[PDB]
CSV table of C-alpha atoms in Angstrom, one decimal:
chain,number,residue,atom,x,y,z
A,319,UNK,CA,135.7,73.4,63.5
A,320,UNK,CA,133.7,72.0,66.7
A,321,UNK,CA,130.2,72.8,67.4
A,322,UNK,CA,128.6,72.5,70.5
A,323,UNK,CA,124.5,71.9,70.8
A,324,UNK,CA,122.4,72.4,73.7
A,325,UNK,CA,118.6,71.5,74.0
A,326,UNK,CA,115.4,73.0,76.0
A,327,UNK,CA,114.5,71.6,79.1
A,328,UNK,CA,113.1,68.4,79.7
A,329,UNK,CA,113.9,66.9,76.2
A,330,UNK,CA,114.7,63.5,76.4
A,331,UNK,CA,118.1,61.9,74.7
A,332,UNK,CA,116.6,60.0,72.0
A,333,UNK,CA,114.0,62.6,71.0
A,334,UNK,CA,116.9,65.3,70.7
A,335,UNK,CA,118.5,64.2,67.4
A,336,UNK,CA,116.1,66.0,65.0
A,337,UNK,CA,115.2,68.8,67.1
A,338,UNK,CA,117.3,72.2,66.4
A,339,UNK,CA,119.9,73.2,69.0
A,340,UNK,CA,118.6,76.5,71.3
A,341,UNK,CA,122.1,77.9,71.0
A,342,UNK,CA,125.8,76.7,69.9
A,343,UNK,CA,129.3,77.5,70.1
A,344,UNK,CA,132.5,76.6,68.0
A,345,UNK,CA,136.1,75.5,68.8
A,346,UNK,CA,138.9,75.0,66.3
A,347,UNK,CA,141.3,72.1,67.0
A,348,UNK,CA,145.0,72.0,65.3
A,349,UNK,CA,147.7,70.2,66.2
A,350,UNK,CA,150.7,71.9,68.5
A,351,UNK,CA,154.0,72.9,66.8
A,352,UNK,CA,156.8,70.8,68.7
A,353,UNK,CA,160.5,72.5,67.0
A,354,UNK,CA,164.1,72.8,67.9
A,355,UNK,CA,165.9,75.5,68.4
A,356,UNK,CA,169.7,75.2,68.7
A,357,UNK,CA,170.7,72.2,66.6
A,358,UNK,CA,170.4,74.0,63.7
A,359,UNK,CA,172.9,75.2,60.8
A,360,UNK,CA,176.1,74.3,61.9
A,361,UNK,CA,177.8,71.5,64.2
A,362,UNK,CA,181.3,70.9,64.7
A,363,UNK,CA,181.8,67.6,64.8
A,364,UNK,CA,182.5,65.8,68.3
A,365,UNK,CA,181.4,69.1,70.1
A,366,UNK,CA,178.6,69.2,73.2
A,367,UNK,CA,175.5,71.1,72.6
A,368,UNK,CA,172.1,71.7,74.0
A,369,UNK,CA,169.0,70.7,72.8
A,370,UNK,CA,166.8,73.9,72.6
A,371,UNK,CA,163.0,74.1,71.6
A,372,UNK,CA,159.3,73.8,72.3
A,373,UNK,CA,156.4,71.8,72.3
A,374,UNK,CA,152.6,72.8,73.2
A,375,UNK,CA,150.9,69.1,73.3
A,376,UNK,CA,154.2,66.9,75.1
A,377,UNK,CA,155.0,64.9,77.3
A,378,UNK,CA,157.8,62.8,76.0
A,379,UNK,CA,160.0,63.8,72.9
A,380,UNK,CA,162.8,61.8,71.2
A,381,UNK,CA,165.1,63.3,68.8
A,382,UNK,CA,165.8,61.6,65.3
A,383,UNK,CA,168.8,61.6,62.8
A,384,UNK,CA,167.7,60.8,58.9
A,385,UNK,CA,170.4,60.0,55.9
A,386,UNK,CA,169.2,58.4,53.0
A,387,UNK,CA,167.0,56.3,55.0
A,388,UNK,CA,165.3,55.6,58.2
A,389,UNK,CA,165.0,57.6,61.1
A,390,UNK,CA,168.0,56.1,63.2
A,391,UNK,CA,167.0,56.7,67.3
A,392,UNK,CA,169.8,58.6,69.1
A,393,UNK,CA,170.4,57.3,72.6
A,394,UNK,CA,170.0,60.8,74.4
A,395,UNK,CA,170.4,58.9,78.0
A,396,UNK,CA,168.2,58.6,80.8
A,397,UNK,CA,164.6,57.2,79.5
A,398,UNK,CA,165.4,59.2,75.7
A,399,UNK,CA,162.7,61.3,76.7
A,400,UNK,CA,162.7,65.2,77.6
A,401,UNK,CA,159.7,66.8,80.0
A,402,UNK,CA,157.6,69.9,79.0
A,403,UNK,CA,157.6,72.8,81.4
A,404,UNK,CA,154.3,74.5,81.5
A,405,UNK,CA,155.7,77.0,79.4
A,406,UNK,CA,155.6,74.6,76.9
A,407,UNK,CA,159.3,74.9,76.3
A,408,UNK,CA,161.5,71.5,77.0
A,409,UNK,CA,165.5,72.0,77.4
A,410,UNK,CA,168.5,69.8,78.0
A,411,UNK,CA,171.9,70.1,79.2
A,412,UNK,CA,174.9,70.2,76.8
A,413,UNK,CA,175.3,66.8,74.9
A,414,UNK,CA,177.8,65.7,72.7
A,415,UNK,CA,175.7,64.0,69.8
A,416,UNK,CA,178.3,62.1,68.2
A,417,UNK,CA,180.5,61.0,71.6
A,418,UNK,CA,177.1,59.6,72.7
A,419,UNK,CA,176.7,55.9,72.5
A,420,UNK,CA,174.4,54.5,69.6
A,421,UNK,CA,174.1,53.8,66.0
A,422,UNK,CA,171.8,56.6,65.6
A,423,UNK,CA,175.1,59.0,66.3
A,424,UNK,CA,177.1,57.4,64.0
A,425,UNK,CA,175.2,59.4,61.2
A,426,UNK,CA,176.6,62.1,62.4
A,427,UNK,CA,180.0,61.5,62.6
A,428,UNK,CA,181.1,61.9,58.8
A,429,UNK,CA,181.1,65.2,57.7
A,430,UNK,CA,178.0,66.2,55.6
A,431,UNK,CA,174.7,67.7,55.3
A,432,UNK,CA,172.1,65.6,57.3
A,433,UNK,CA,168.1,65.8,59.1
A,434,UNK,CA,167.3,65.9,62.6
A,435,UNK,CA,163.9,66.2,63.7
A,436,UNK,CA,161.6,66.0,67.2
A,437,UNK,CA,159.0,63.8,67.6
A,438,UNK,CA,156.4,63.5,70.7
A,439,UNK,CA,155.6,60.2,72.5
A,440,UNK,CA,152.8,59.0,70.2
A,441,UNK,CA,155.0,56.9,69.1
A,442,UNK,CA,155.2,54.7,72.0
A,443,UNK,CA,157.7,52.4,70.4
A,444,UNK,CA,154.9,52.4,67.5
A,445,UNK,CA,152.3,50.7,69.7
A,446,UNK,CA,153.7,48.9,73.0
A,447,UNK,CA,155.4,49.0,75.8
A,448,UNK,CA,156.1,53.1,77.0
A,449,UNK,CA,159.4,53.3,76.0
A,450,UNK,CA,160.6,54.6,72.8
A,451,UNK,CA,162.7,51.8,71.1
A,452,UNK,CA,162.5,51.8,67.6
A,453,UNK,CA,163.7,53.3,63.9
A,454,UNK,CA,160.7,54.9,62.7
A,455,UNK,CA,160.5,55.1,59.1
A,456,UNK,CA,159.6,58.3,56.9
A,457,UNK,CA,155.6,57.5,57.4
A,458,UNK,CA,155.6,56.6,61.0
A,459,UNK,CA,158.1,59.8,61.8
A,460,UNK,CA,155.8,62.3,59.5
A,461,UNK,CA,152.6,60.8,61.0
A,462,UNK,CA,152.8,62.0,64.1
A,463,UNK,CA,153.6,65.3,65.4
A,464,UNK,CA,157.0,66.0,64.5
A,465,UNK,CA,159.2,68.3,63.0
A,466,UNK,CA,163.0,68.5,61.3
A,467,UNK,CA,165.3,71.3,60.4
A,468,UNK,CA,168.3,70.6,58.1
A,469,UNK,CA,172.0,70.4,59.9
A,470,UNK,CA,175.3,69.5,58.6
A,471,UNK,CA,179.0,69.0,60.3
A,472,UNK,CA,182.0,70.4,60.0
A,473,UNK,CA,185.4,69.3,60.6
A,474,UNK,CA,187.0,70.2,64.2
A,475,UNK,CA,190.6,72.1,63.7
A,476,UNK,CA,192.4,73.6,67.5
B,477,UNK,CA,137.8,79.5,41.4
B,478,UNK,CA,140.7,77.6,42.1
B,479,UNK,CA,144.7,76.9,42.3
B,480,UNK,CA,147.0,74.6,42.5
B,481,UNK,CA,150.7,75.4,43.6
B,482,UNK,CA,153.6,73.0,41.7
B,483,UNK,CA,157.4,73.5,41.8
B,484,UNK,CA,158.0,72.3,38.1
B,485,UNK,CA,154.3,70.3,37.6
B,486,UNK,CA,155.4,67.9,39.8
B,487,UNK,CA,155.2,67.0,44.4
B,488,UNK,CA,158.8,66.3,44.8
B,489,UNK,CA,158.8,63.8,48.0
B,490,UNK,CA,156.6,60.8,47.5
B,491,UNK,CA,156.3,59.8,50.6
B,492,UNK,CA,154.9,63.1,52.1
B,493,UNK,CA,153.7,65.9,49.2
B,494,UNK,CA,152.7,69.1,50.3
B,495,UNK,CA,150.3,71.4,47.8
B,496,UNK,CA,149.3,74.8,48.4
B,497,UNK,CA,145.1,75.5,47.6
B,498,UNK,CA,143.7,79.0,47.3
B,499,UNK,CA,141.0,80.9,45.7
B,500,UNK,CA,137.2,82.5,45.3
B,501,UNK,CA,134.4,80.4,46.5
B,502,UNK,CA,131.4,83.3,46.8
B,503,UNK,CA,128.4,82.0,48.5
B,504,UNK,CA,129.7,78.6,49.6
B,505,UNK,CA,129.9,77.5,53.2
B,506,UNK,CA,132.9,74.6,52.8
B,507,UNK,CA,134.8,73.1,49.8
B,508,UNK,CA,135.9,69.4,48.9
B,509,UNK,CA,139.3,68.7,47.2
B,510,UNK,CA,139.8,65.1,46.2
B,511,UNK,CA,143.2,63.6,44.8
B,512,UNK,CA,143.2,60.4,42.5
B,513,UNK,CA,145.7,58.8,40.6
B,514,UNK,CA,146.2,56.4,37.8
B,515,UNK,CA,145.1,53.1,40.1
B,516,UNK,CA,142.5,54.9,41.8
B,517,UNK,CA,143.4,55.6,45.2
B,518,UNK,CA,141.7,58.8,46.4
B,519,UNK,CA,142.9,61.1,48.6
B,520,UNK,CA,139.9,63.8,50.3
B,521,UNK,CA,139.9,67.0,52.5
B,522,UNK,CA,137.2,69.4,53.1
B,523,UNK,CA,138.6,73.0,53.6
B,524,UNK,CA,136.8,76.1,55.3
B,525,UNK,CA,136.2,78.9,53.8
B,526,UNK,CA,135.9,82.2,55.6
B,527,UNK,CA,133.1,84.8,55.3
B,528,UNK,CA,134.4,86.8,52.2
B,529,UNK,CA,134.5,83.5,50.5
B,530,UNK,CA,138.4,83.3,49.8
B,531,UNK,CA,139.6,79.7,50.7
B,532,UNK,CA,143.3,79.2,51.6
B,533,UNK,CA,144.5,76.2,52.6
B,534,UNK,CA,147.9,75.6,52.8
B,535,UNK,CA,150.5,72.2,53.3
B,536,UNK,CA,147.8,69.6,52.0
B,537,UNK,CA,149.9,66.3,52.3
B,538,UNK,CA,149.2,64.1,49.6
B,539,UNK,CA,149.3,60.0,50.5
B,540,UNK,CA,148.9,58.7,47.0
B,541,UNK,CA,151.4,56.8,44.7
B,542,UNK,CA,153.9,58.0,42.0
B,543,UNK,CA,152.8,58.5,38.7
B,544,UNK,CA,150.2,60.8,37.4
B,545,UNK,CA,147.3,62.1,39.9
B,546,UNK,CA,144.8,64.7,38.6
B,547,UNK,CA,142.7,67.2,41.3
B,548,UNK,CA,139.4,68.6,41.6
B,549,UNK,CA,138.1,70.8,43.5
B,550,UNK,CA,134.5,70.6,44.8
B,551,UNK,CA,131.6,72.9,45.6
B,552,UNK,CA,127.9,72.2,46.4
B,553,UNK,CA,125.8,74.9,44.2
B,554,UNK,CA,122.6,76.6,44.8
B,555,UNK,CA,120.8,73.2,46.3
B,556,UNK,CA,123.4,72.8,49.4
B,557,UNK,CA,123.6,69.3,47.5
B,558,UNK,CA,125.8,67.2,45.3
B,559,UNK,CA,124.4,67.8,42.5
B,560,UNK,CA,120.8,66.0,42.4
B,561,UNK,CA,121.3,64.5,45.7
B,562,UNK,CA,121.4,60.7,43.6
B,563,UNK,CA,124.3,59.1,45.2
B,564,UNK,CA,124.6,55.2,44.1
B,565,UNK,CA,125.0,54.4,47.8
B,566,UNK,CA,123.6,57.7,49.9
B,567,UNK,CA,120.4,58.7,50.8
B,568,UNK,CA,118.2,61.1,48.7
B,569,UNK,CA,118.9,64.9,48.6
B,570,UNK,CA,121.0,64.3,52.1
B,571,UNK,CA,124.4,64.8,49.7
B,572,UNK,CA,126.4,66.7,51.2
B,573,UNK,CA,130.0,66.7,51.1
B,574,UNK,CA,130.6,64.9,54.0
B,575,UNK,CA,127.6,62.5,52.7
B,576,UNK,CA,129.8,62.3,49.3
B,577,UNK,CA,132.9,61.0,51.3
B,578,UNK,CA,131.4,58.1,52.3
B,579,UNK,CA,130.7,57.4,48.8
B,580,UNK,CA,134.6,57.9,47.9
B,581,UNK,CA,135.3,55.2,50.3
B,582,UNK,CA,133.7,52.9,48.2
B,583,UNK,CA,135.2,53.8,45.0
B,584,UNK,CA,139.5,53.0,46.2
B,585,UNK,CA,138.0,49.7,47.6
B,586,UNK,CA,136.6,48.2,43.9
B,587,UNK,CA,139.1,47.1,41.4
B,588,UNK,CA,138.5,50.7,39.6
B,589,UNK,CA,140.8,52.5,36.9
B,590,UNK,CA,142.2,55.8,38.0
B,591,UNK,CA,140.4,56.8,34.3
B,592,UNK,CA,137.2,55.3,35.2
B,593,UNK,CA,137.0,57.3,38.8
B,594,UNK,CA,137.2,60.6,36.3
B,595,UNK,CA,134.7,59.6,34.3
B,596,UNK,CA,132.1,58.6,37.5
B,597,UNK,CA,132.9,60.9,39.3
B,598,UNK,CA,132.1,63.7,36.8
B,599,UNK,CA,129.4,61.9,35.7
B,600,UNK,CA,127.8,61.2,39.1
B,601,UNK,CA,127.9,65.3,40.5
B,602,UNK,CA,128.8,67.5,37.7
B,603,UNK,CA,127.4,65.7,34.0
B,604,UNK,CA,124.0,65.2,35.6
B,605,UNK,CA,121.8,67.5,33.5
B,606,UNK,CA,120.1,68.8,37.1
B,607,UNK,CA,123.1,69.4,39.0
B,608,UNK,CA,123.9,73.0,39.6
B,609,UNK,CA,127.2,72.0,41.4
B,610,UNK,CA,130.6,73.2,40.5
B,611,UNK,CA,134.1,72.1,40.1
B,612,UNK,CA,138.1,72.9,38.8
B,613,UNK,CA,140.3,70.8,37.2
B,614,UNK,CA,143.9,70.5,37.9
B,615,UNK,CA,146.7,68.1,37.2
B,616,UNK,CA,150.1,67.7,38.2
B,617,UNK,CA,152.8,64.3,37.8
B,618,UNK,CA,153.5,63.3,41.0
B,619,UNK,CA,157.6,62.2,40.5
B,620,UNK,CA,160.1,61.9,42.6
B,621,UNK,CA,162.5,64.2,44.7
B,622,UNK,CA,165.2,65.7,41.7
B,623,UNK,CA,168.0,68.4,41.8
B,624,UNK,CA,170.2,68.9,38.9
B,625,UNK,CA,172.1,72.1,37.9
B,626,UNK,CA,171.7,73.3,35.0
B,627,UNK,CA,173.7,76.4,34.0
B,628,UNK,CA,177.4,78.2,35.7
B,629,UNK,CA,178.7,81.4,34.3
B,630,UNK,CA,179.9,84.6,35.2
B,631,UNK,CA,178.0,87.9,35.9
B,632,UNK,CA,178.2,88.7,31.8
B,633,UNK,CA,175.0,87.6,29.0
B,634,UNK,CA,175.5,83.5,28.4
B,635,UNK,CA,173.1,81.0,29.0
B,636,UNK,CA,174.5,77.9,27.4
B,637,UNK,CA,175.6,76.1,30.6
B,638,UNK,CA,179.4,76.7,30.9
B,639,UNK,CA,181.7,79.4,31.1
B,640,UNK,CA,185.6,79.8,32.1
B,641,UNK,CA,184.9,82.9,35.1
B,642,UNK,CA,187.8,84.7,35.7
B,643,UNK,CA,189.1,85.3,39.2
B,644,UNK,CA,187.6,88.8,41.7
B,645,UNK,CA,184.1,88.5,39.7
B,646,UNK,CA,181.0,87.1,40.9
B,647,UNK,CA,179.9,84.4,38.9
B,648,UNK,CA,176.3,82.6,39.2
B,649,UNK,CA,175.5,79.2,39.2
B,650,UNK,CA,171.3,77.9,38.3
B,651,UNK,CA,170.4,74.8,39.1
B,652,UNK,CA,166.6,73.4,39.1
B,653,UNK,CA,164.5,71.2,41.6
B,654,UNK,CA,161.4,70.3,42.9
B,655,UNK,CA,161.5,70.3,46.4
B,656,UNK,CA,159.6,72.8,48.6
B,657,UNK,CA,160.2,77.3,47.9
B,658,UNK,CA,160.8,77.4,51.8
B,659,UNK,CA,160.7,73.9,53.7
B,660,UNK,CA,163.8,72.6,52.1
B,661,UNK,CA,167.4,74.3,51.0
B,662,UNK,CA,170.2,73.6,48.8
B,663,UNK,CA,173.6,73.6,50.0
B,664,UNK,CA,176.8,74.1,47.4
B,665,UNK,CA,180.2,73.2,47.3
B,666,UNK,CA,183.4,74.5,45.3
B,667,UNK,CA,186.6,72.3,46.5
B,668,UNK,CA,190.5,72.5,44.7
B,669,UNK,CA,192.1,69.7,42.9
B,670,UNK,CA,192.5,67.7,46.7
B,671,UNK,CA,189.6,68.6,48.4
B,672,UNK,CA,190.8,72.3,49.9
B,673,UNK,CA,186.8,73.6,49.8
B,674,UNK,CA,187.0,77.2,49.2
B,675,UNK,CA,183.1,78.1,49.3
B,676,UNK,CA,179.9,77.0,50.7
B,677,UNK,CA,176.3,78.9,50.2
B,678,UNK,CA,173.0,77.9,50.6
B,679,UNK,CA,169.5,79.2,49.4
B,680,UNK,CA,166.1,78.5,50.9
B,681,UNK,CA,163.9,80.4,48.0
B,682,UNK,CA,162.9,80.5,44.8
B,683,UNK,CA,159.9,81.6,43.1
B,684,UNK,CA,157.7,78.6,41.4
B,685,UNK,CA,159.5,78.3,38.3
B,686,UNK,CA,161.7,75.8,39.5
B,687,UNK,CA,165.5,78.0,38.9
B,688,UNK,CA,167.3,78.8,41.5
B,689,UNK,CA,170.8,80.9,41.7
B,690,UNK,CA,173.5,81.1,44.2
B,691,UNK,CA,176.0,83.9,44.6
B,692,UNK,CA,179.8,83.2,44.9
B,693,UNK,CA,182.9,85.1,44.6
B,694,UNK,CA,186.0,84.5,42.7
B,695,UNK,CA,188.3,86.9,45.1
B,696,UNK,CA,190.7,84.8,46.6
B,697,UNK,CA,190.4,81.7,44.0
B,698,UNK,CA,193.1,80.2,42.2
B,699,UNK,CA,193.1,79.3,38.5
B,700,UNK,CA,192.9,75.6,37.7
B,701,UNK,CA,189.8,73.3,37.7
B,702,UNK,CA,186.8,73.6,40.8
B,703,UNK,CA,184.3,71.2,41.5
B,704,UNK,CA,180.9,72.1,42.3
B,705,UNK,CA,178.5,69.8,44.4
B,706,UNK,CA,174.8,70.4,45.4
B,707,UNK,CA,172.9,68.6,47.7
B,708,UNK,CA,169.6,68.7,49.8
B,709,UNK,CA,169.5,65.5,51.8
B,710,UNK,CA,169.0,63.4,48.0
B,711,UNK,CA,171.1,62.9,45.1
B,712,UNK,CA,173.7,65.0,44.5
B,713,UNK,CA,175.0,66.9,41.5
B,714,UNK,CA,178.8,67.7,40.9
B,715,UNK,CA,179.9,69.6,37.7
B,716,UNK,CA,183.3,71.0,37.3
B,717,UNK,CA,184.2,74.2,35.8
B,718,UNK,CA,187.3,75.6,34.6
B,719,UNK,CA,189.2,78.9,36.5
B,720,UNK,CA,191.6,81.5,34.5
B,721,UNK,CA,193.2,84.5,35.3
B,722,UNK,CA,191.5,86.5,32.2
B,723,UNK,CA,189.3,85.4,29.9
B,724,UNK,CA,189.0,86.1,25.9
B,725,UNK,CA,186.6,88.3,24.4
């Protein structure tokens, strides 16, 4: 909670700190919930999909794969960033998570139950240049605001 | 009054814990809750309570180390102090719990035994013969992330752990873990002599005990020898279990 204090008229800066406020008023700050929607629950492997969610405080989000381990980045595309309508609702076209090119897909290409999470652009490539280039570990991805859902793959039969 | 929330007695991930705080705090305008474990790193956050003085804070992350960490749960009494206001490093009757935070900062920095922080700390706000100021105590061993399962059987009375289930009835399996009721899930597997998997279920509940069941059926199986594997992003379990047409009894 956030309280706001304002002081009579004429009252210098200094002399204000004892004095008691004429009136207040208090504001709560959280942090925004930034989720996905549509990779979620099941994922045939070597299929296109979109990625589907929302985020209130964004302006760039990355997506992360986890398996025993670090956060691996997965190389989205174009600037491996997503904008945030004023909606506060972010969207991309279909992509194919494991044809993509990266290290970060390769995860995904064995069958098995695995993490995907969002993450906004406080990362920042963990303090740097404005790009997001890294493998953030468990602390550095949970830090933030972030979130993960649980996703696994299954074999692809025509 | 006070509670703490534990799967089994134990935070399950390490590296980010998550315990759930509720309870009666009559009369009380905020309330501290400090974590510290055998070193004697400390871990604070002050929680609001509301107007009918019933705190509930929920997803407290926990950034301590493995081992053993004991809770308390603060409260400044009557005097809107801690205790006698006589902190070693803050001002006189200006103890608040804010004020006391400062003084927590100081304790994580010395060379202190996660023993000796208990025994200051409850000597420095609660033993003092003038302090009206209350607190809880709680532990819980903070461990790592486990999953086992424990005991497969059919829908009849058994609880030893095994059990030939005969094909077209239900049977249940009960594992236990320590992960999260709701945040986490637990995945199964049942898969033929060369890897033909014939079922797959998941569960996202169970109550605080730390057991959980999953529901499978036995319609279409075969009789032979079925493997069961469990997993939630961690070690997994695999226990096999044998599959007949009709049992004895």
């Amino acid at each position: 909670e956030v309280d706001l204090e304002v002081y009579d008229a004429g009252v210098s800066a200094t002399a204000a700190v004892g004095q008691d406020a004429t009136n207040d008023i208090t504001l709560t700050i959280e942090e925004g919930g930034t989720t996905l929607s549509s990779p979620t629950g099941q994922y045939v492997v070597g299929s296109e999909v979109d990625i589907n969610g929302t985020a209130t405080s964004s302006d760039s989000v990355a997506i992360y794969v986890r398996d025993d381990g670090d956060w691996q980045l997965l190389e989205i595309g174009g600037d491996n960033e997503i904008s945030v309508d004023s909606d506060d609702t972010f969207e991309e076209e279909d992509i194919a998570l494991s044809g993509l090119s990266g290290d970060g897909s390769s995860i995904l290409s064995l069958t098995g139950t695995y993490r995907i999470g969002v993450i906004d652009a406080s990362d920042a490539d963990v303090g740097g240049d404005g790009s997001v280039d890294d493998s953030l570990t468990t602390s550095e991805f949970t830090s933030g605001v972030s979130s993960s859902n649980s996703i696994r793959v299954t074999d692809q039969a025509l | 009054t006070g509670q703490f929330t534990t799967i089994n007695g134990q935070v399950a991930p390490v590296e980010t814990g998550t315990v759930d705080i509720n309870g009666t705090a009559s009369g009380a305008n905020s309330v501290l809750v400090i974590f510290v474990d055998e070193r004697g790193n400390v871990n604070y956050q002050e929680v609001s309570v509301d107007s009918d003085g019933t705190y509930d804070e929920d997803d407290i992350t926990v950034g301590l180390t493995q081992g053993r960490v004991t809770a308390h749960i603060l409260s400044v009494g009557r005097d809107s102090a801690i205790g006698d206001g006589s902190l070693p490093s803050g001002p006189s009757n200006g103890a608040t719990l804010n004020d006391l935070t400062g003084y927590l900062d100081t304790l994580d920095q010395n060379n202190n035994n996660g023993e000796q922080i208990n025994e200051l700390i409850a000597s420095e706000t609660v033993d003092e013969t003038a302090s009206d100021d209350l607190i809880v105590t709680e532990t819980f061993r903070l461990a790592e992330s486990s999953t086992s399962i424990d005991s497969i059987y059919p829908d009849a009375a058994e609880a030893a752990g095994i059990n030939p289930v005969a094909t077209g009835e239900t049977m249940v399996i009960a594992g236990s873990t320590n992960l999260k009721p709701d945040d986490n899930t637990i995945s199964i597997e049942v898969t033929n002599e060369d890897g033909t998997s014939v079922a797959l279920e998941d569960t996202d509940e169970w109550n605080n005990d730390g057991q959980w069941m999953v529901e499978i059926d036995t319609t279409d199986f075969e009789t032979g020898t079925f493997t069961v594997e469990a997993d939630d992003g961690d070690n997994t379990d695999t226990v096999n279990v044998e599959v007949v047409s009709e049992r004895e009894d």
